[PDB]
Design a protein around this ligand. Structure first.
Ligand code: CLA
Ligand code: CLA
Ligand code: CLA
Ligand code: CLA
Ligand SMILES: CC(C)=CCC/C(C)=C/CC/C(C)=C/CC/C(C)=C/CC/C(C)=C/CC/C(C)=C/CC/C(C)=C/CC/C(C)=C/CC/C(C)=C/CC1=CC(=O)C(C)=C(C)C1=O
Ligand SMILES: CCCCCCCCCCCCCCCCCC(=O)OC[C@H](CO[C@@H]1O[C@H](CO)[C@H](O)[C@H](O)[C@H]1O)OC(=O)CCCCCCCCCCCCCCCCC
Ligand SMILES: CCCCCCCCCCCCCCCCCC(=O)OC[C@H](CO[C@@H]1O[C@H](CO)[C@H](O)[C@H](O)[C@H]1O)OC(=O)CCCCCCCCCCCCCCCCC
Ligand SMILES: CCCCCCCCCCCCCCCCCC(=O)OC[C@H](CO[C@@H]1O[C@H](CO)[C@H](O)[C@H](O)[C@H]1O)OC(=O)CCCCCCCCCCCCCCCCC
Ligand SMILES: CCCCCCCCCCCCCCCC(=O)OC[C@H](CO[C@@H]1O[C@H](CS(=O)(=O)O)[C@@H](O)[C@H](O)[C@H]1O)OC(=O)CCCCCCCCCCCCCCC
Ligand SMILES: CCCCCCCCCCCCCCCC(=O)OC[C@H](COP(=O)(O)OC[C@@H](O)CO)OC(=O)CCCCCCCCCCCCCCC
Ligand SMILES: CC1=C(/C=C/C(C)=C/C=C/C(C)=C/C=C/C=C(C)/C=C/C=C(C)/C=C/C2=C(C)CCCC2(C)C)C(C)(C)CCC1
Ligand code: OEX
Ligand SMILES: [Fe+2]
Lengths: 35, 334, 42, 30, 245, 50, 52, 38, 42
């Protein structure tokens, strides 16, 4: 009820931004082949 | 050296107890909220207007239920397809009345299962595995999104969605029979063949390995202790189980290749459940199964009954009785 | 009229502590058969 | 009084799931 | 208002505006004509209260506790028509048509859900004087129908005008001379009509626009599910609005 | 070789597991008071507090 | 007000400052390592193993 | 983890002390049952 | 109205067979600690 609502958009785009900037973090290079 | 690189090194570490990964960044917060709301809504949750007629259906344990009858009730017919979060409900009492937690559980479930699926990909990348276990898990993800997401979309309401329970499942299956005739639809036919075939080739492969085990134990200890973990010797005579099934049916019907054998175990169920979950999907938009009612006639023109006409009279019994107060007009358009 | 929570008091007051004391005896005899090294140690 | 048994069966089932995941007998080569 | 009529349909929907009665502006007098017929009377309650046994310091006299509505925005009456007949002493109103019932459900402390049909069916209003004034005050009785029409089926499948009449999955109850007469009350479904008393009060009139509006107070009785329980007295308050024509 | 009434004296010369035990008595005391008070709200009836 | 056609469900002005400070608070973490790097260094691979 | 605890001991209960503890529970079950059933 | 012999069915259907399976594990680990000969055999 507009105080809870603020709390959800924090928590969503906290973890969504960890997802988005996780695969931008040179993620294909993280393999057991090399580096 | 940086704080982000020391965080990416931890979150993608296979040296954790459970691999978290980048999909776990939105698997774990989603599925723990679908869980922690499910346990509360299954145990302690007030009754829910499902038919939109202000007749609240009890579904939790504190309101006199058990494991079988208790269920998280779907949302109201009054809401229908509208998004109904907590902050758009003006109190939690108004939220729990109108079928609140069904949308909170389901939407955090389908995000967490579609992230559990991508997490099975990710660890296969970091371990050197060939990647496609997550394609086999697409088959229950197709079926979970068919009864919780796609079928409420094409029917236009989450109230037609599947109730999160055990007796609510059979309320879902029978009402789906009367309104859509799923048993005559060839995609439920192609997945009954998927799980009857799947449980066949499971118990047929699991018997021929256990039949042809090599002597490594005594008769006092267990059969299973003849396998030391991580050994490089083959633990069963595969030529023996090939010569058995090569005589049990005939010679040319037997896979001598164990790789092509262990692929056919993954093909048959998964293709059977992809096809089935697109049976619920095409019947979400009212493209029903076959209808052979009044199909056999004599030369006079009188209707001769068939087995489909007996099956029709079972469908007419459920059709005239499902949601016995919600209807006002002669045709169940919804 | 008797109290129906007394069946749960007595029959768990018997079985749960008495099955406990059996376990301390079975693992006692297993340690003695464990050290002894003959036909039962494994 | 009746639903107290159902709750104890459910959370008691989730205990042995917890112990099976974290206190598992870890398999070792050699 | 006319300000509401300025908007289109796509601007009103989803905003919760169609639930709310209009706000009349200004105060003057208006006289009902001989053939005067009331046009757009809407009634919307803004607060609800159910008579209960309240926990005071040492005493348990009956008082009204308030309650939170749980059906969302479906409480307002609308489009209520009716001719305004002129008796000599007092101007009267008798409603004829329009949406004059709005079923709703409020929740008490303790978790009890009390549904009630909020209605103004067969209303006979009577108010002092002839012309509508800011001091005008009319009211009268209305008949509440039952919350369920008699062909409603309960969970066992029993209704007043349809359904079974015995416990359908308890077939050994109708054995003996007594039958199932121990649970007789839950088999006989009785359609119930009660009374309600609304008291309206005009306080703001337009005569150049011929639309009035003021504060009411309505009391009635909640439902019983055809004799399943004792119904409870429900008080409510709000604002109304009417077009006098 | 401990008797059954001396089984919990392995924690005498171990401060690190003296805490893990004292945390487990705390997790049972606190879990009691939560699950006792949940049991009492299913039984309580606020109809007449007089 | 549910069925309003508002961007990302942003009903009030206060919810924007939540969104901007969520993407940027992790963006600034990300630029602490992958930002301020050479934007002109290529490869003829399928996959780059350049640096941290 | 850390290393193995040097405070590992073993628990013993001979056949004698089994029958004491069984008879202790059943006689307390005989005695206190009549009061619990009330 | 529920059957009051079902509490005895369920809570002994849980505890009596589940306490049985615990005992076969405790004496299994006691035999392994019995043969091993160090600090726990006795
Ligand atoms: C991080 C994982 C996660 C995810 C994905 C969700 C997702 C959701 N939650 Mg949930 N929740 C979470 C964690 C999460 N939750 C946690 C940890 C808690 C506990 C505090 C909750 C508690 C909670 C409650 C209590 C409720 C929800 C609700 C919801 C739903 C709507 C919330 C909303 O407005 O989203 C905000 C989303 C956005 C603003 C969109 C972000 C998407 C970005 C912008 C990516 C898009 C990229 C863009 C298109 C690129 C454009 C490029 C341009 C050039 C065009 C949604 C399904 C509600 C619900 O389901 O009710 C039915 C609800 O009531 N959640
Ligand atoms: C259904 C979920 C799903 C899953 C498990 C995967 C899985 C995969 N995708 Mg993929 N993808 C999907 C949907 C999905 N995809 C969709 C729907 C799109 C179109 C928008 C894409 C576009 C896409 C591209 C362009 C790339 C991948 C890549 C990959 C691989 C690595 C993960 C990655 O970085 O992608 C990140 C994850 C996504 C892009 C999808 C996130 C899906 C979330 C977790 C659930 C579904 C939510 C929904 C689609 C988002 C709605 C937001 C809105 C409400 C605001 C992996 C095999 C990469 C790869 O390896 O290619 C070789 C790559 O570069 N995907
Ligand atoms: C001999 C009888 C028979 C058989 C074998 C089947 C077989 C099947 N029917 Mg069918 N049916 C029958 C008779 C039969 N039918 C009759 C008589 C009717 C009319 C009443 C129907 C009506 C009917 C309907 C209406 C539906 C089926 C469906 C299905 C399929 C179910 C598979 C499924 O959903 O798994 C797929 C797996 C899942 C859905 C589960 C997903 C779970 C996710 C991945 C994870 C969950 C994790 C969990 C929460 C926690 C994990 C544990 C935790 C501790 C970690 C399967 C092909 C369903 C279908 O078509 O497929 C959708 C369906 O909706 N049938
Ligand atoms: C602050 C409380 C406290 C603490 C921390 C201890 C701690 C200890 N006591 Mg001690 N003790 C206490 C109170 C306490 N005692 C009291 C109040 C008495 C009087 C009854 C005793 C009498 C006593 C004796 C006679 C002996 C000890 C011994 C011991 C040591 C080992 C305990 C053991 O092996 O039991 C293991 C116990 C069991 C395996 C099962 C016991 C089963 C009980 C009887 C019934 C079940 C308990 C029940 C569920 C508890 C309900 C909660 C209730 C307390 C509110 C340990 C240092 C022993 C010692 O000196 O160490 C060498 C010893 O011989 N204590
Ligand atoms: C002279 C007179 C008197 C005149 C009368 C004329 C007369 C004599 C008539 C009589 C003739 C008569 C009728 C005889 C015909 C005999 C006959 C065939 C009768 C039976 C009737 C009948 C309906 C039979 C058809 C049914 C039949 C047996 C079908 C077979 C089904 C089939 C082909 C299944 C294959 C499935 C399959 C691919 C399995 C492999 C996959 C699987 C996981 C297996 C496991 C597995 C396999 C391995 O391979 C190995 C290696 C290992 C490790 C392993 O895990
Ligand atoms: C391992 C063993 C597990 C079993 C434990 C065995 C303990 C048995 C003794 C307790 C059970 C006996 C209770 C009677 C059974 C009964 O039906 O009661 C049933 C009653 C509940 O009573 C029921 O309540 C319902 C609503 O609450 C309805 O009203 C029912 O009508 C009413 O009967 O339960 C109890 O009274 C349990 C009390 C247990 C707590 C004990 C408090 C007193 C402890 C004082 C501690 C002093 C100790 C000092 C040391 C000595
Ligand atoms: C292929 C499968 C199908 C894919 C999905 C198809 C796309 C569906 C259309 C998506 C709509 C996108 C529009 C913006 C979002 C929207 O407005 O939602 C915003 C809506 C609107 O939200 C509601 O709006 C209402 C207004 O009418 C009210 O204001 C409510 O308060 C407000 O909550 O909320 C949600 O649906 C939240 C979604 C949260 C899901 C986030 C998870 C995404 C994580 C995936 C990882 C990111 C990677 C993908 C990005 C690249
Ligand atoms: C170790 C575990 C120990 C527990 C055993 C657990 C078994 C639980 C299941 C049996 C108990 C469930 C009975 C209901 C409880 C109840 O109150 O009943 C109570 C009833 C007794 O019924 C009572 O009777 C009283 C006078 O007799 C009064 O009339 C009471 O009103 C009446 O309720 O008890 C039973 O019915 C016990 C029956 C047990 C025997 C089973 C017969 C059927 C077996 C068929 C075998 C087929 C198996 C094939 C393989 C599969
Ligand atoms: C009137 C119209 C007539 C029909 C018209 C045709 C329509 C389209 C037909 C589509 C054919 C697709 C061919 C795919 C071949 C392939 O899968 O190879 C995969 C391998 C290759 O074989 C392996 O091949 C290897 C040799 S090599 O790879 O092929 O060179 C060999 O090493 C190995 O031993 C051998 O097993 O085969 C196997 O492992 C066995 C599985 C075979 C699967 C084909 C059956 C069809 C699917 C089952 C039915 C659906 C299941 C769900 C039902 C509910
Ligand atoms: C919530 C969880 C509930 C937890 C409950 C679980 C614990 C319950 C059981 C534990 C107590 C067990 C007692 C074991 C008993 C036990 O094993 O005895 C043996 C024990 C000590 O024996 P030793 O030191 O010889 O032990 C050597 C070791 O090898 C084994 O203990 O004696 C005592 O501790 C004192 C004597 C009590 C013996 C009982 C004497 C009274 C006799 C019975 C009287 C009844 C007949 C009366 C006739 C009128
Ligand atoms: C029936 C009945 C009843 C009830 C009762 C009950 C309810 C009980 C319960 C009880 C309980 C429920 C109890 C519990 C207890 C427990 C315990 C005693 C435990 C212990 C623990 C431990 C042992 C731990 C361990 C560990 C871990 C896990 C990890 C780490 C390490 C350690 C060691 C810490 C009554 C009387 C009312 C009435 C009558 C009848
Ligand atoms: O909501 Mn659940 O079920 Ca699908 O059909 Mn129409 O809607 Mn209602 O009726 Mn029938
Ligand atoms: Fe295999």
């Amino acid at each position: 009820m507009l105080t809870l609502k603020i709390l959800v958009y924090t928590t969503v785009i906290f973890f969504v931004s960890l997802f988005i900037f996780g695969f931008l973090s040179s993620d294909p290079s993280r393999n057991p082949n090399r580096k | 050296v940086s704080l982000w690189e020391r965080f990416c090194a931890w979150i993608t570490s296979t040296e954790n107890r459970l691999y978290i990964g980048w999909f776990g960044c939105l698997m774990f917060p989603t599925l723990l909220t679908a869980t922690s709301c499910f346990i509360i809504a299954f145990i302690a949750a007030p009754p829910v207007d499902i038919d939109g007629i202000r007749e609240p259906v009890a579904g939790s344990l504190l309101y006199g239920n058990n494991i079988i009858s208790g269920a998280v009730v779907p949302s109201s017919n009054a809401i229908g397809m509208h998004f109904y979060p907590i902050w758009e409900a003006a109190s939690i009492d108004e939220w729990l009345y109108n079928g609140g937690p069904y949308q909170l559980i389901v939407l955090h479930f389908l995000l967490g299962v579609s992230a559990y699926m991508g997490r099975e990909w990710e660890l296969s990348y970091r371990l050197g595995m060939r990647p496609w276990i997550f394609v086999a898990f697409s088959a229950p993800v197709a079926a979970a999104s068919a009864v919780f997401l796609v079928y409420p979309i094409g029917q236009g309401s989450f109230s037609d969605g599947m109730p999160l329970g055990i007796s609510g499942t059979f309320n879902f299956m029978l009402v789906f029979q009367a309104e859509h005739n799923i048993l005559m639809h060839p995609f439920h036919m192609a997945g009954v063949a998927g799980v009857f075939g799947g449980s066949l080739f499971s118990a047929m492969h699991g018997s021929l390995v256990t039949s042809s085990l090599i002597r490594e134990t005594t008769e006092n200890e267990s059969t299973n202790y003849g396998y030391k973990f991580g050994q490089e010797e083959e633990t069963y005579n595969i030529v023996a189980a090939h010569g058995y099934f090569g005589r049990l049916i005939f010679q040319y019907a037997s896979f001598n290749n164990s790789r092509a054998l262990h692929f056919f175990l993954a093909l048959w169920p998964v293709v059977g459940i992809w096809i089935t979950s697109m049976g619920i999907s095409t019947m979400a938009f009212n493209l029903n199964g076959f209808n052979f009612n009044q199909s056999v006639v004599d030369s006079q023109g009188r209707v001769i009954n068939t087995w489909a006409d007996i099956l029709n009279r079972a469908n007419l019994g459920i059709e005239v009785m499902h949601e016995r107060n919600a209807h006002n007009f002669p045709l169940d358009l919804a | 009229e008797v109290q129906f929570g007394a069946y749960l008091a007595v029959l768990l007051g018997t079985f749960l502590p008495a099955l406990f004391l059996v376990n301390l005896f079975i693992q006692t005899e297993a340690r003695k058969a464990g050290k002894a090294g003959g036909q039962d140690s494994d | 009084m009746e639903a107290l048994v159902y709750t104890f069966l459910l959370i008691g089932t989730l205990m042995v799931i917890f112990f099976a995941v974290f206190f598992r007998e870890t398999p070792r080569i050699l | 208002k006319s300000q509401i009529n300025e908007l289109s349909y796509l601007q009103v929907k989803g905003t919760g505006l169609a639930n709310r009665c209009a706000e009349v502006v200004g105060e003057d007098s208006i006289k009902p004509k001989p053939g005067a017929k009331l046009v757009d009377m809407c009634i919307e309650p803004k607060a609800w209260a159910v008579e209960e046994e309240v926990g005071k310091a040492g005493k348990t006299e009956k008082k009204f506790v308030n309650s939170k509505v749980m059906t969302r925005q479906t409480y307002t009456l609308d489009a209520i028509e009716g001719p305004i007949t002129v008796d000599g002493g007092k101007i009267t109103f008798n409603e004829k048509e329009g949406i004059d019932y709005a079923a709703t459900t409020v929740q008490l402390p303790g978790g009890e859900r009390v549904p009630f049909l909020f209605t103004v069916k067969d209303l006979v209003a009577k108010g002092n004087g002839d012309t509508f004034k800011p001091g005008f005050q009319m009211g009268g009785d209305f008949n509440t129908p039952s919350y369920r029409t008699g062909l409603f089926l309960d969970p066992k499948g029993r209704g007043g005008t349809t359904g079974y009449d015995m416990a359908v999955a308890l077939p050994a109850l109708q054995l003996g001379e007594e039958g199932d007469a121990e649970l007789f009350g839950e088999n006989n479904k009785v359609f119930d009509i009660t009374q309600g008393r609304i008291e309206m009060e005009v306080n703001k009139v337009n005569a150049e626009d011929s639309e009035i509006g003021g504060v009411f107070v309505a009391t009635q009785l909640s439902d019983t599910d055809m004799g399943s329980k004792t119904p409870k007295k429900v008080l409510t308050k709000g604002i109304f609005y009417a077009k006098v024509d | 070789a401990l008797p059954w009434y001396r089984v919990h004296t392995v924690v005498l010369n171990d401060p690190g597991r003296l805490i893990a035990v004292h945390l487990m008595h705390t997790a049972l005391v606190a879990g009691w008071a939560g699950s006792m008070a949940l049991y009492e709200l299913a039984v309580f009836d606020p109809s007449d507090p007089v | 007000t549910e069925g309003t056609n508002e961007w990302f469900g942003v009903d009030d002005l206060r919810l924007l400052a939540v969104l901007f400070l969520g993407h940027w608070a992790i963006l600034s973490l990300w630029l602490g390592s992958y930002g301020d790097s050479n934007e002109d260094e290529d490869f003829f691979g399928e996959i780059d193993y350049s640096a941290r | 983890m850390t290393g193995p605890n040097p405070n590992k001991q073993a628990v013993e209960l001979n056949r004698t002390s089994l029958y004491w503890g069984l008879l202790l529970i059943f006689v307390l079950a005989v005695l206190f049952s009549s009061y619990f059933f009330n």
